[PDB]
């Protein structure tokens, strides 16, 4: 945590805590200027708690004195920490006004509310008068700037502790916190600026959880040497589809092709295999003869033979979920000595004992409902639960890609968060594309974790490049947008 | 203008 | 001085000196980013003295660590003040490299030199190894950023103390110092940024010497009410010219007209008076009958009658300097009960006893040669000598406008510095225009000091609006440019 | 001469003469491509003499073979020098066609004539069949490219040796020759390109005669330090005008002011002095009391007093030419211990013995009629006679500026040629402006030669900036254009 | 970028 | 094009 | 400029 980074910076590096606090508060002023333009016509109401968050607020208020139209601090705490006390003293010595009672009508006389009530030191549900003030601020229609984290968000989880400030702009220090990255906190944060307030760069970099960035993805993209052939860019087998679900194979296959894979083969029950090549004749779509339209143990041997000539196998989209599919999937994965990308119905039938026995790598790509069924918990217990994702990945020796508006990618040691995308991906087919992308990057030589990092980012970013309203985005359009997302990274 | 005069 | 502003801010307001020092150094980083763009490709050499200037330099260096290509500090002092010592310690704790010997070839390995050797604490001529280092830096062709003031400029006078750093960018704190404003220091400062580092606004405003700004001049410009007539905008008499100097009256008269004066009358020896109206027929140019082409006591009575119907009288441009002119000028000014603008040859013959006896106001507009003769000192002793200008103004109850590339305007209590203009004003005629402008603004209701402040600014700014090379600017073109300077203020 | 530069490059530096000849001919091809665009649609007729010029032509012809529509060489010489012979042999080995008889109708079948008949080895009037061929080429309306110099121009003088080729494009080697620079040759040269064909740079720079270039003038322009005053930029006295010629003083005075001079004073017979300040009130125009409207010995003492307070004196424009003016001018210049710029009627009455006795410098600015009268020769003998200008300058210890469409500036050791300007300067008043410009630059600290170099260039370049047809340019407009010429240099 | 990441 | 093909 | 002055 940053709490540890702050401590080391003070205690071992010797930076006075007052210096960190001064830099935090001025960062806020500068961030506000960048967003609002010239500050001199605005009236500011600064809401300060008794903690260091409030101390940062007193620095903000003091630095606006004499330079803006009006500043008032409402001090809502009981006691003040030493740095909040020093800053409160400075604010008054500089001629600043403080009141200790919040009058509902006070909001009327101000244009900008600076929320410095609670930061990362929030413990427990917000109730009582703190809650009424926060509710009044949220109904007020004023511009809200939150110091560090919107008051009421738990900065380790992104949960709302009964009530929380909804900010237009949040200015945080050193690094983004998990509560800015996961929802609902991500929503309540609004526009986030991360300010450098003087921590050693080595400490800021010792953080083990990361937001996936454009620069990270650009540096991970495989090379395309000019003297290459399709074998240079790998081969994917996708085991997918059924008489019920004939579209999934096509979306996965093209997902691998659009990210630059050399060769993609689908194994799909006949005659549903013919659907793929009618749409995209660049795909190889092998007919699998099945008894009743679903994979079963009768197809195990043919699928293992098909897998010998490829670099990676993706399995699960549209397979259906019955006992014969369960038998096939688990026996297949137990025997397959290739990296596996495991999605959708292959997750629903997965025996997790099988993952532990595999010598070869795997990536699992569940949404929360699938993760919930996989570990036998409720959706609410697994959703955005990055520590559970980490334990699972570590215990099962896999990469886990837990899908949601913020996607978590972890191998148990490193955890990345993806924030690209929009609600046009909340539609059948989206996931099938991502499965193909991941398999494809693995085929091109990226590690399972690297492949997953690059794929979640580009999948979300392609969605944002859709030119019309996001709710009309479909998987087919997403596929079209992938090479543009790639070009825009570079 | 909060930080610098030109 | 800012030294006093710093002291009060620490001792009475309670701001830790370390906080001021941190804000100073970060201001420098941000100013450099604004000028250089992204800092991450540059290598920085930071030259730190043992004083607080050097301490500011250690803050700069520390804040570049891990974020730019390379940083090295050469520490050139002997001992360190407490804040320089604290900062030096921080720079090393953060992993920064310091060396204490300056190797001439070291300049080769760096792109930007940060000059934090001496600030406002400079005492005496720079010699020895400090001088060699400064001379090496000046020959190096690198980008030079000076902290507070370029090392070697006396910050109270703008003089070079034997040798001084020539900066591309100077970042100073709180307010500009006199040494940035007066030459040579103004030249060595290069581009100046003034950073707010947290002093109370009340202290920053208790400064009694000021740079004349666009906003100040805009707020001083007289109103032009729609229901007005020429009498609304005042009347000027200009007593000027001689058989030798027939152009000066014309330039002064039009200077009053271009700034918005309602009526302008010249009193000029016949037939030289006819020169004015041949060029600008809007002028009234009264013929004065003289014995030999110069004003004398024989014209005293006519000039006093002419002055009864005006608001202000300007006297001196092109009068010539002989005994009869001296008699006339001094007897005239002794008797004239109107504001007087006194320039050129009227200064050269002025008896300063006369100024003390006048009940009415005066403004004097000498260049340094004229000021030197007026107080019987050398040009070198009076040039940029704002304290002597102040004493003179105070002792003689006048406004003194001491002309030079930076013009000083003072009434003895308030002193303003003008920095608009260019070398196209270093040419016969320029001064005659300014005399007219000042008279004109007085006629329109500005105080002598206000009139002088507005006129020096607009005169310099008109010169900068000349569209071709400044060396070809002439007074006639300057006159043409005045209404454009006025429009651009608004 | 380049003939010597060629010899040294072969004999001492060791460059094979064939290499120089190859580089010359390819330079021609490349220059033609730059002017005509792609060469492949054009048919080329190459006219080769038996000398090295013709050898260069055979190189051109050979290098067009197989790459353009058609090439034919007409070889017009009798014998071939060794390099022309080697190249003729190469042209034929490569399959090229040569004929030795020029048929008038042959011009019909070609688009471009390459004139490689005679170069710098031309001796004597061109007659006979060489003349008929050159006359046929000039009547043909084809594009003509001359190798080195248009055949028939004397490359040391620019004279036409009975008849000469009129070229659209001339490609010369190493340095421009005098015959490209002086008329008529300059006219017949058309567009000139100077190719580097491999001479050591040291030899190319050992040339003592130079074309005045933009880069040369930019490097000579005086500095305008910001902390300056009018005294920084010098003072000029102009002694000029008469009852007959009242405009000349005004044009000279403003010529000094437009080039950046600090102060300009005219001494002009009363009341003609008042003309100057009615037009430009920035000028000081001192009335000189004369008996009959012309300077005479009676004004000697006043003019010497006026000259004590200036840096340079210009004399002559509009003085008139009678015996009393002659007495005054010669006695004045004999006594004046300041640099003198001597023009117009001061030249017409000058006793050249006086120039030899002066300890102080002078610049003389005659047109050819004035130079002719000064040395007692015909206009035809002095016009473009740079060797006579050099001898005169050297014998009389002065700088001579011999005005014409190409102006020659020499002090006897260094000779510069000016090629800026147009026929709008062929009008009364032009010369009076240039006199002022020269005086002005001297006043600003340039040597007489430097002042003359910069002034002739900027005077011509200002003329070219006139926005309407050049024949309507007048001196007053020229003055307006000077500061724009200055800005465009930079 | 010295002060803020976006 | 006389000197160089691209 | 290596080959030609204009
Ligand atoms: N749920 C709650 N209801 C009412 N008051 C609450 C509260 N939670 C914390 N505080 C109050 O605010 C302080 C934290 O502010 P802060 O985020 O500025 O805390 P810091 O001073 O930054 O403390 P650390 O995060 O531990 O550092 C707490 O100590 C408590 O008194
Ligand atoms: N609102 C949102 N913002 C950004 N990304 C969103 C999203 N909703 C879903 N996804 C993203 O879309 C895919 C859904 O696959 P799925 O497996 O839930 O199901 P479908 O194949 O789409 O059915 C996942 O990558 C998820 O991150
Ligand atoms: N001419 C000189 N030659 C060599 N060393 C000189 C010097 N002048 C000052 N110092 C040395 O540098 C310090 C001032 O730095 P500074 O401008 O940072 O001074 P401050 O610490 O800022 O001191 P004040 O301006 O008094 O505050 C002096 O105390 C002296 O040791
Ligand atoms: N280099 C410079 N930069 C900016 N302003 C400059 C200047 N030089 C002179 N002035 C300005 O021009 C006028 C000269 O009047 P003068 O009285 O020296 O003499 P003239 O009438 O110009 O002769 C003054 O206002 C001065 O500030
Ligand atoms: N006026 C004339 N009428 C007829 N023929 C004339 C001639 N002048 C020269 N040539 C003929 O052309 C040659 C020079 O060519 P060139 O300019 O190429 O001479 P170079 O070979 O370059 O000789 P240099 O300039 O001395 O080297 C002469 O030697 C003569 O035979
Ligand atoms: N056709 C031309 N091209 C370029 N420059 C030309 C020119 N004709 C004259 N000049 C130039 O104009 C001035 C005439 O002064 P002047 O002394 O002959 O006589 P005026 O005062 O013009 O009468 C000289 O500088 C000359 O170089
Ligand atoms: K907060
Ligand atoms: K410094
Ligand atoms: K030729
Ligand atoms: Mg799915
Ligand atoms: Mg003056
Ligand atoms: Mg002439």
PDB file of C-alpha atoms and ligand atoms in Angstrom, chain A residues 3 49-54 79 81 117-127 130 161, ligand 1:
ATOM      1  CA  UNK A   3       0.400   3.901   3.462  1.00  0.00           C
ATOM      2  CA  UNK A  49     -12.015  15.781   8.128  1.00  0.00           C
ATOM      3  CA  UNK A  50      -9.629  15.556  11.051  1.00  0.00           C
ATOM      4  CA  UNK A  51      -7.204  13.154   9.343  1.00  0.00           C
ATOM      5  CA  UNK A  52      -4.437  13.669   6.878  1.00  0.00           C
ATOM      6  CA  UNK A  53      -6.968  13.842   4.069  1.00  0.00           C
ATOM      7  CA  UNK A  54      -8.384  16.898   5.746  1.00  0.00           C
ATOM      8  CA  UNK A  79      -9.587  15.937  16.611  1.00  0.00           C
ATOM      9  CA  UNK A  81      -3.756  14.675  13.360  1.00  0.00           C
ATOM     10  CA  UNK A 117     -13.395  14.482   4.440  1.00  0.00           C
ATOM     11  CA  UNK A 118     -12.026  10.876   4.411  1.00  0.00           C
ATOM     12  CA  UNK A 119      -9.201   9.369   2.402  1.00  0.00           C
ATOM     13  CA  UNK A 120      -7.591   5.968   2.570  1.00  0.00           C
ATOM     14  CA  UNK A 121      -8.067   6.104   6.382  1.00  0.00           C
ATOM     15  CA  UNK A 122     -11.807   5.372   6.076  1.00  0.00           C
ATOM     16  CA  UNK A 123     -12.920   2.660   8.468  1.00  0.00           C
ATOM     17  CA  UNK A 124     -16.493   1.444   8.382  1.00  0.00           C
ATOM     18  CA  UNK A 125     -19.874   2.578   7.110  1.00  0.00           C
ATOM     19  CA  UNK A 126     -20.409   6.351   6.911  1.00  0.00           C
ATOM     20  CA  UNK A 127     -23.463   7.341   8.973  1.00  0.00           C
ATOM     21  CA  UNK A 130     -21.118  12.765   7.665  1.00  0.00           C
ATOM     22  CA  UNK A 161     -19.217   2.258   2.663  1.00  0.00           C
TER      23      UNK A 161
HETATM   24  N1  LIG H   1     -16.638   5.550   8.945  1.00  0.00           N
HETATM   25  C1  LIG H   1     -16.311   6.609   9.696  1.00  0.00           C
HETATM   26  N2  LIG H   1     -17.266   7.424  10.274  1.00  0.00           N
HETATM   27  C2  LIG H   1     -16.895   8.586  10.913  1.00  0.00           C
HETATM   28  N3  LIG H   1     -15.562   8.940  10.961  1.00  0.00           N
HETATM   29  C3  LIG H   1     -14.609   8.148  10.413  1.00  0.00           C
HETATM   30  C4  LIG H   1     -14.977   6.977   9.762  1.00  0.00           C
HETATM   31  N4  LIG H   1     -13.856   6.372   9.287  1.00  0.00           N
HETATM   32  C5  LIG H   1     -12.783   7.122   9.612  1.00  0.00           C
HETATM   33  N5  LIG H   1     -13.235   8.240  10.303  1.00  0.00           N
HETATM   34  C6  LIG H   1     -12.363   9.316  10.847  1.00  0.00           C
HETATM   35  O1  LIG H   1     -11.498   9.923   9.876  1.00  0.00           O
HETATM   36  C7  LIG H   1     -10.154   9.526  10.078  1.00  0.00           C
HETATM   37  C8  LIG H   1      -9.565   9.029   8.762  1.00  0.00           C
HETATM   38  O2  LIG H   1      -9.285  10.085   7.861  1.00  0.00           O
HETATM   39  P1  LIG H   1      -8.076   9.951   6.807  1.00  0.00           P
HETATM   40  O3  LIG H   1      -8.502   9.126   5.596  1.00  0.00           O
HETATM   41  O4  LIG H   1      -7.462  11.280   6.494  1.00  0.00           O
HETATM   42  O5  LIG H   1      -7.079   9.117   7.741  1.00  0.00           O
HETATM   43  P2  LIG H   1      -5.505   9.372   7.782  1.00  0.00           P
HETATM   44  O6  LIG H   1      -5.217  10.516   8.714  1.00  0.00           O
HETATM   45  O7  LIG H   1      -5.033   9.633   6.360  1.00  0.00           O
HETATM   46  O8  LIG H   1      -5.161   7.939   8.429  1.00  0.00           O
HETATM   47  P3  LIG H   1      -4.495   6.697   7.649  1.00  0.00           P
HETATM   48  O9  LIG H   1      -5.181   6.316   6.341  1.00  0.00           O
HETATM   49  O10 LIG H   1      -4.483   5.521   8.607  1.00  0.00           O
HETATM   50  O11 LIG H   1      -2.995   7.254   7.319  1.00  0.00           O
HETATM   51  C9  LIG H   1     -10.188   8.395  11.128  1.00  0.00           C
HETATM   52  O12 LIG H   1      -9.064   8.303  11.987  1.00  0.00           O
HETATM   53  C10 LIG H   1     -11.476   8.647  11.898  1.00  0.00           C
HETATM   54  O13 LIG H   1     -11.303   9.492  12.999  1.00  0.00           O
END
